[PDB]
Amino acid sequence: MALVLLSFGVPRKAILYPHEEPSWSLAKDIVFHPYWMIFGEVYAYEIDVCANDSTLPTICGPGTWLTPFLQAVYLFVQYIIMVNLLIAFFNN
Amino acid sequence: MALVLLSFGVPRKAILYPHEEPSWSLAKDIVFHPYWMIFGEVYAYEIDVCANDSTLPTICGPGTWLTPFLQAVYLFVQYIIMVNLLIAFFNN
Ligand SMILES: CCCCCCCC/C=C/CCCCCCCC(=O)O[C@@H](COC(=O)CCCCCCCCCCCCCCC)COP(=O)([O-])OCC[N+](C)(C)C
Ligand SMILES: CCCCCCCC/C=C/CCCCCCCC(=O)O[C@@H](COC(=O)CCCCCCCCCCCCCCC)COP(=O)([O-])OCC[N+](C)(C)C
Ligand SMILES: CCCCCCCC/C=C/CCCCCCCC(=O)O[C@@H](COC(=O)CCCCCCCCCCCCCCC)COP(=O)([O-])OCC[N+](C)(C)C
Ligand SMILES: CCCCCCCC/C=C/CCCCCCCC(=O)O[C@@H](COC(=O)CCCCCCCCCCCCCCC)COP(=O)([O-])OCC[N+](C)(C)C
Ligand SMILES: CCCCCCCC/C=C\CCCCCCCC(=O)O[C@@H](COC(=O)CCCCCCCCCCCCCCC)COP(=O)([O-])OCC[N+](C)(C)C
Ligand SMILES: CCCCCCCC/C=C\CCCCCCCC(=O)O[C@@H](COC(=O)CCCCCCCCCCCCCCC)COP(=O)([O-])OCC[N+](C)(C)C
Ligand SMILES: C[C@@H]1CC[C@@]2(OC1)O[C@H]1C[C@H]3[C@@H]4CC=C5C[C@@H](OCCC(CO)CO)CC[C@]5(C)[C@H]4CC[C@]3(C)[C@H]1[C@@H]2C
Ligand SMILES: C[C@@H]1CC[C@@]2(OC1)O[C@H]1C[C@H]3[C@@H]4CC=C5C[C@@H](OCCC(CO)CO)CC[C@]5(C)[C@H]4CC[C@]3(C)[C@H]1[C@@H]2C
């Protein structure tokens, strides 16, 4: 579950925030939101930053249409596989 | 689950709200948000009160960078251990 997290957080941060200098915030932002997704927070208005209802309209740019695909895959793997494998683990 | 709640709510309220006089609101605020976290509410924009997207920018201060670590631990214990132990309890 922590590998699936960084498999997602590093492409997400890199596609959406390219013009970043080295900063310890990069360590946070690859790990922060993807963890809070495990706990019910979809960040519905930060998906598809190029949308009209977006809360991150300044983040719209080239390649940012990839992030909703990435996150669809992410949560499928987390909840529909890895959370229920863990429910299955405990119950058995 | 109620002990894990107060293990979290009392450090959270104390790190973020230091300049408080005695008040019956302290009884609420150590118990209120941590309970609503069990039920899907991550309070995504009250985590990291020193962030740009914060809804509590006036709460930013010394030591408030500790609260996202505390809450990461909190929900791990609630859902990933204590909710699924309870799913496991009932099913067995
Ligand atoms: C192997 C397993 C197979 C998986 C299943 C198949 C996968 C699903 C496939 C879905 C098809 C793809 C949909 C996008 C189509 C093109 C979008 C486009 O051109 O314009 C849009 C861009 O929007 C984007 O670029 C966002 C991309 C879509 C994200 C989909 C995430 C998956 C969620 C669901 C996953 C579950 C799927 C459930 C299946 C039933 C917007 O239009 P525009 O003119 O560019 O902009 C208008 C301006 N505005 C934005 C300000 C309003
Ligand atoms: C289930 C039923 C679903 C329906 C199926 C029908 C599919 C139809 C396919 C439509 C694709 C073509 C439409 C857009 C044409 C290009 C121009 C455009 O609008 O680009 C948009 C992005 O989107 C793209 O650039 C294209 C996205 C391609 C992938 C779509 C999913 C492939 C099928 C599924 C496979 C998935 C893999 C699954 C893995 C498990 C850019 O628009 P924007 O984002 O608003 O940004 C504009 C602003 N900006 C210039 C500042 C950036
Ligand atoms: C034993 C078990 C091991 C556990 C695993 C390892 C634990 C994970 C470890 C993560 C590493 C720590 C990340 C923070 C790094 C420093 C941040 C910094 O310097 O600046 C940031 C401060 O931000 C903070 O102070 C918030 C602290 C991070 C909260 C992380 C919570 C854990 C969520 C994930 C947990 C799951 C982890 C998943 C693992 C794959 C911001 O930068 P700034 O310049 O200060 O401010 C810029 C201004 N601005 C804010 C207005 C924009
Ligand atoms: C998995 C991969 C993850 C990546 C790993 C890489 C780690 C890199 C480590 C980076 C730490 C150093 C960077 C910051 C330097 C100090 C200055 C600074 O910006 O301070 C910031 C806070 O943050 C801190 O003060 C430091 C946080 C230390 C703990 C980080 C996690 C330790 C590793 C994990 C262990 C966890 C235990 C797990 C338990 C299970 C203050 O910034 P702010 O918050 O925006 O507030 C500013 C405004 N104010 C002045 C009003 C307050
Ligand atoms: C394969 C499933 C079916 C889909 C088939 C059809 C799709 C085939 C694949 C990809 C289609 C790529 C073209 C679509 C973009 C057109 C619109 C556009 O310009 O968008 C963006 C750029 O986008 C790019 O520059 C695209 C980057 C190259 C593609 C990288 C591979 C991604 C998919 C993985 C590989 C594929 C395999 C994945 C396996 C599932 C917008 O940038 P811009 O134009 O500069 O906007 C101006 C910005 N400004 C205003 C802020 C200045
Ligand atoms: C251990 C895991 C790896 C991490 C190792 C590296 C980290 C090692 C540990 C801790 C690092 C502490 C220093 C980081 C803060 C630097 C930036 C700063 O000033 O932040 C804040 C202060 O912060 C403090 O004053 C810190 C308080 C002391 C640390 C208490 C222990 C916490 C961790 C538990 C013990 C550790 C064991 C935990 C086990 C997991 C900001 O306050 P300020 O400066 O006044 O801001 C101005 C505010 N104004 C503008 C509103 C006026
Ligand atoms: C196998 C796993 C693959 C993913 C991963 O773990 C192992 O690989 C690690 C490498 C880390 C980076 C290494 C060096 C720096 C430079 C630093 O520069 C301070 C600049 C300035 C502050 O303003 C000084 O004053 C910023 C942080 C950064 C980019 C690290 C981020 C976290 C990264 C990406 C880690 C990540 C979790
Ligand atoms: C084992 C467990 C450890 C945690 C815990 O349970 C037991 O320990 C309890 C002690 C309680 C406090 C005791 C006294 C007061 C003073 C009062 O002062 C009114 C001031 C003014 C109003 O404006 C009068 O007019 C405000 C409330 C406060 C601080 C209690 C808060 C809840 C606390 C922290 C409880 C908490 C749930």
Swiss-Prot record, chains A, B:
Give residue spans on the Extracellular membrane side: 18-19, 61-63
- Give its localization: Cell membrane; Cytoplasmic vesicle membrane
Tell me how the protein is altered or processed after translation: Autophosphorylated; autophosphorylation regulates TRPM7 kinase activity towards its substrates.
Residues annotated as transmembrane: 1-17, 64-92
* Intramembrane segments of this protein: 20-60
Instruction: Please give the knockout or disruption phenotype noted for this protein.
Output: Inactivation of Trpm7 in mice results in early embryonic death (6.5-7.5 days). Mice die as a result of trophoblast defects and consequent failure of implantation. Tissue-specific null mutants shown defects in cardiac and renal morphogenesis, organismal Zn(2+), Mg(2+), and Ca(2+) homeostasis and thrombopoiesis.
Question: How is expression of this protein distributed across tissues?
Answer: Found to be expressed in brain and skeletal muscle, with stronger signals in kidney, heart, liver and spleen.
Q: Describe its partners and assembly state.
A: Homodimer. Homotetramer. Forms heteromers with TRPM6; heteromeric channels are functionally different from the homomeric channels. Interacts with PLCB1.
Q: Which family does it belong to?
A: In the C-terminal section; belongs to the protein kinase superfamily. Alpha-type protein kinase family. ALPK subfamily.
Its biological purpose is as follows: Bifunctional protein that combines an ion channel with an intrinsic kinase domain, enabling it to modulate cellular functions either by conducting ions through the pore or by phosphorylating downstream proteins via its kinase domain. The channel is highly permeable to divalent cations, specifically calcium (Ca2+), magnesium (Mg2+) and zinc (Zn2+) and mediates their influx.
**What is the protein's name according to its record?**
Transient receptor potential cation channel subfamily M member 7
Which lineage ranks, top first, belong to the organism behind this chain?
Answer: Eukaryota, Metazoa, Chordata, Craniata, Vertebrata
**Which gene is transcribed and translated to give this protein?**
Trpm7
**Where in the full protein does the shown chain start and end, and how long is the full protein?**
1007 to 1098 of 1863
